[PDB]
Structure 1
Amino acid sequence: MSLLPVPYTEAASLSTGSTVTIKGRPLVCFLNEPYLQVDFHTEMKEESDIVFHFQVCFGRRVVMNSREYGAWKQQVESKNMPFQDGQEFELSISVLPDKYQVMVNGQSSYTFDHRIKPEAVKMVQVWRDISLTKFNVSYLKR
């Protein structure tokens, strides 16, 4: 179906049971090392703090972090690479009480314990070297 603009910005709220679903594909082969970045921002401004930073170097590594009062905190680096060269991915990020859980094509792939309350999130940005066909934030829970 249709392409969303990239970089993609949507105003968002998150609490426990919220799911962010992202369908997309890398713009180029893994040999050229395309990136994907998903940032959960505390304001609509791109300079705002990031509760959850998720950055894929396709075929190589994933880094997760937070930016709190303008400053990057403890990097978590993963060599877990469920993303397939040249394929569409479906990414689903669940807000559990203790952490974010990242599902890649239906497989649990990364978790990241909450450093800031998910209620602090006001915006989600999806950007770098991807096309996007689907973006959804679920709003079913009290």
Structure 2
Amino acid sequence: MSFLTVPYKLPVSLSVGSCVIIKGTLIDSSINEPQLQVDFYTEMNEDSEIAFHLRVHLGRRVVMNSREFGIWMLEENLHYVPFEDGKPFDLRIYVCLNEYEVKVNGEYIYAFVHRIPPSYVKMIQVWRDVSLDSVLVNN
């Protein structure tokens, strides 16, 4: 079947114990835009708060942040970038009580402490030049 059309938006309801599972392929095809971006919004509106932001600059960093009252807050940077041009990835984001646990290809890579309660997230958007197989939320 066909890759999901990006930018891809999905209405969701997150609780503690939820898991967002994103499977796709990144490619080295942009000048200074990230190759993958995942934003968790508090409304089905792109001006609303971003409880959780993850983006991938291949060979450089994975960056996580939040956008609260229009302001991009403290960037948390990983220099472990388990993403590779043209290889399929398995990105799992688990909702725990105090943090999202970010897991890639079966590896625990980062715990991002909640800045907005995850129960306020209403919409997930996955975009940048990603070839997206699936996005789904398990309870």
Please say whether Structure 1 and Structure 2 have the same fold, judged by a TM-score greater than 0.5: yes
Deviation for aligned residue 1:82: 1.3
In 1: Cα distance, 2:52 partner to 2:23 partner: 19
Please say if residues 34 and 57 of structure 2, whose CA atoms lie closer than 8 Å, have aligned partners that are also in contact: yes
Q: TM-score, normalised by structure 2?
A: 0.92
Please say if residues 44 and 123 of structure 1, whose CA atoms lie closer than 8 Å, have aligned partners that are also in contact: yes
Number of equivalenced pairs? 139
In 1: Cα distance, 2:64 partner to 2:84 partner: 20
Please say if residues 62 and 80 of structure 2, whose CA atoms lie closer than 8 Å, have aligned partners that are also in contact: yes
1:40-119 equivalence runs, <5 A: 40-119=40-119
Q: TM-score, normalised by structure 1?
A: 0.90
Deviation per CA, 1:44-90: give whole Å up to 9, x if none: 01111100010111221011111111111111111111113320101
Structure-1 residue corresponding to 2:15: 15
In 2: Cα distance, 1:94 partner to 1:112 partner: 10
In 2: Cα distance, 1:17 partner to 1:101 partner: 11
In 2: Cα distance, 1:94 partner to 1:52 partner: 12
- 1:119 partner SS: helix
Please say if residues 36 and 128 of structure 1, whose CA atoms lie closer than 8 Å, have aligned partners that are also in contact: yes
Where structure 1 has 5 or more consecutive residues not aligned to the other structure, the ranges are none
Instruction: State the one-letter code of the partner of 1:71.
Output: I
CA distance 1:26–1:72, change in 2 (3 Å): same
Structure-2 residue corresponding to 1:132: 132
The percent identity for this pair of structures is 53
Where structure 2 has 5 or more consecutive residues not aligned to the other structure, the ranges are none
